[PDB]
Amino acid sequence: GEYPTVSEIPVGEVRLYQIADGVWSHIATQSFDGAVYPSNGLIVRDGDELLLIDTAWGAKNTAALLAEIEKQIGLPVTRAVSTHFHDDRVGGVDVLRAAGVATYASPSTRRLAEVEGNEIPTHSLEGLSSSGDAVRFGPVELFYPGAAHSTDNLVVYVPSASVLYGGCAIYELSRTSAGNVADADLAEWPTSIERIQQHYPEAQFVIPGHGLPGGLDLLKHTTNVVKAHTNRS
Amino acid sequence: GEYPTVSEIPVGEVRLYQIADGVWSHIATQSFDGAVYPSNGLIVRDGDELLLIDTAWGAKNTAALLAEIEKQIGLPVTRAVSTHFHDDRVGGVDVLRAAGVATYASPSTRRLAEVEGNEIPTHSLEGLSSSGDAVRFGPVELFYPGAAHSTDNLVVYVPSASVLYGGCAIYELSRTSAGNVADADLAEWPTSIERIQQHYPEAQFVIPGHGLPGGLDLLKHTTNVVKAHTNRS
Ligand SMILES: O=C(O)c1ccccc1C(=O)c1ccc(F)cc1
Numbered sequence A, B: 001g002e003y004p005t006v007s008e009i010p011v012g013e014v015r016l017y018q019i020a021d022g023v024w025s026h027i028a029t030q031s032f033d034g035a036v037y038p039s040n041g042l043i044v045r046d047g048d049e050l051l052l053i054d055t056a057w058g059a060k061n062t063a064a065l066l067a068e069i070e071k072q073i074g075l076p077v078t079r080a081v082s083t084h085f086h087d088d089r090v091g092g093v094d095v096l097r098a099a100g101v102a103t104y105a106s107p108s109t110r111r112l113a114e115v116e117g118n119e120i121p122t123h124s125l126e127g128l129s130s131s132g133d134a135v136r137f138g139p140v141e142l143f144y145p146g147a148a149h150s151t152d153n154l155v156v157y158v159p160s161a162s163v164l165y166g167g168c169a170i171y172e173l174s175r176t177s178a179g180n181v182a183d184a185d186l187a188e189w190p191t192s193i194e195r196i197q198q199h200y201p202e203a204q205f206v207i208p209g210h211g212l213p214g215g216l217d218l219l220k221h222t223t224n225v226v227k228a229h230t231n232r233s
């Protein structure tokens, strides 16, 4: 159907949106510095199990996420991957672990989460420390495009569905000014986006970390926004 | 909660919240770069008429505001004051004017609105050109504390109810980082806030331009956020 928005999702609730066969986004909302933001993650069917990409931004949301998954899909979440160290990606990992989910992230992400004081995924994703690195993880490919929104941000591609989940390294088209860039590498971000373009030029659905999905034109859009921020005054 | 938040307010709709006898805030929402922000204005009864402080941030919202006022309160809005030149304060002035509301702002605000290509209130408020200047305007006192969020920003005090409307010069507590300060005077903002404290030490209610009301604590909170931003937090 049409993608759910912040005004449709009370804080504490989670919506699912089926993108293709065996692939959903999950959408949640969270209060953040005097505003409410939407936030996307991904769900990918993994045989008779589910692979989860990112938490629902907090413990309460992540418990709600698991309940909504049980209601709409009814298959067990067995593994989760967090795509960088911020709380909209790892906040809720403890809830996932308590539910029996094996939680994963790169050593970079685990390292930074610990420094920040955020929840730490249990298992390490090896083979992703160098820009351009790709590793298979069941029904998806994990890709480290280089530093962008954060130094550790990963993107996730679902080859069966041509779905590219860009996480917070990719902006929705509606967003024409930079988001939180305190941990960003502005100098490298466009270069990292071009790596994504070069590695997944066949992508048909592109899912930003926050907001409305689109196609590959989200990449150049993000670069345009990032470059404009870079040139601020 | 009690005070309404963005989750309780569909975009295009407006809520009224009675603060004290004959004093309400009006709350609306608007999209800003993929996120939704709440926004406050004020309504003050003056006899059998109403004084409006600030639009509801746009033509559609401001129409909804007038309809909600007539539905809930049922007294005519005869005058409106915009507290600075940004769209969330003058956006909807044309709607007000068309509806027979006399619109006001300082000459400074009117000029800046014009340069910005925004809607321009009809009438000019004298006696507010120097920091520390105050004038009575019906049931309120208008106060120019000096440059802060903008060089023209006004604050409004309702002496009958000890209600201080700080507009966007005052941040809500949940806001711990500076917002849009493109037009701000960061150097003078703390000094301007101190003028507010000095003039209205007896204030019991403090309404920020966006978000939850509180007490006079919101002033020093705002000063802390501004000084941190000044020092590149
Ligand atoms: O990804 C973004 O750009 C973004 C967009 C909207 C709101 C917040 C962010 C954000 O960065 C964030 C940082 C830390 C955190 F705990 C949660 C989120």
Ligand SMILES: O=C(O)c1ccccc1C(=O)c1ccc(F)cc1
Pocket: B032, B037, B086, B087, B088, B168, B179, B180, B181, B209, B210
């Ligand atoms: O008052 C603020 O700091 C603020 C808070 C939330 C969202 C926007 C703003 C804002 O500055 C704004 C600037 C220009 C404009 F046309 C409308 C609003």
Ligand SMILES: [Cl-]
Pocket: A101, A102, A103, A122
């Ligand atoms: Cl495990």
Ligand SMILES: [Cl-]
Pocket: A102
């Ligand atoms: Cl395991």
Ligand SMILES: [Cl-]
Pocket: B101, B102, B103, B122
């Ligand atoms: Cl008039």
Ligand SMILES: [Cl-]
Pocket: B102
């Ligand atoms: Cl008149």
Ligand SMILES: [O-]
Pocket: A086, A088, A168, A209
């Ligand atoms: O994020």
Ligand SMILES: [O-]
Pocket: B086, B087, B088, B089, B168
């Ligand atoms: O504003």
Ligand SMILES: [Zn+2]
Pocket: A084, A086, A149, A150, A168
């Ligand atoms: Zn982030």
Ligand SMILES: [Zn+2]
Pocket: A102, A123
């Ligand atoms: Zn394990």
Ligand SMILES: [Zn+2]
Pocket: A086, A088, A168, A209, A210
């Ligand atoms: Zn994010």
Ligand SMILES: [Zn+2]
Pocket: B084, B086, B149, B150, B168
């Ligand atoms: Zn403003």
Ligand SMILES: [Zn+2]
Pocket: B102, B122, B123
């Ligand atoms: Zn007139």
Ligand SMILES: [Zn+2]
Pocket: B086, B088, B168, B209, B210
């Ligand atoms: Zn404002």
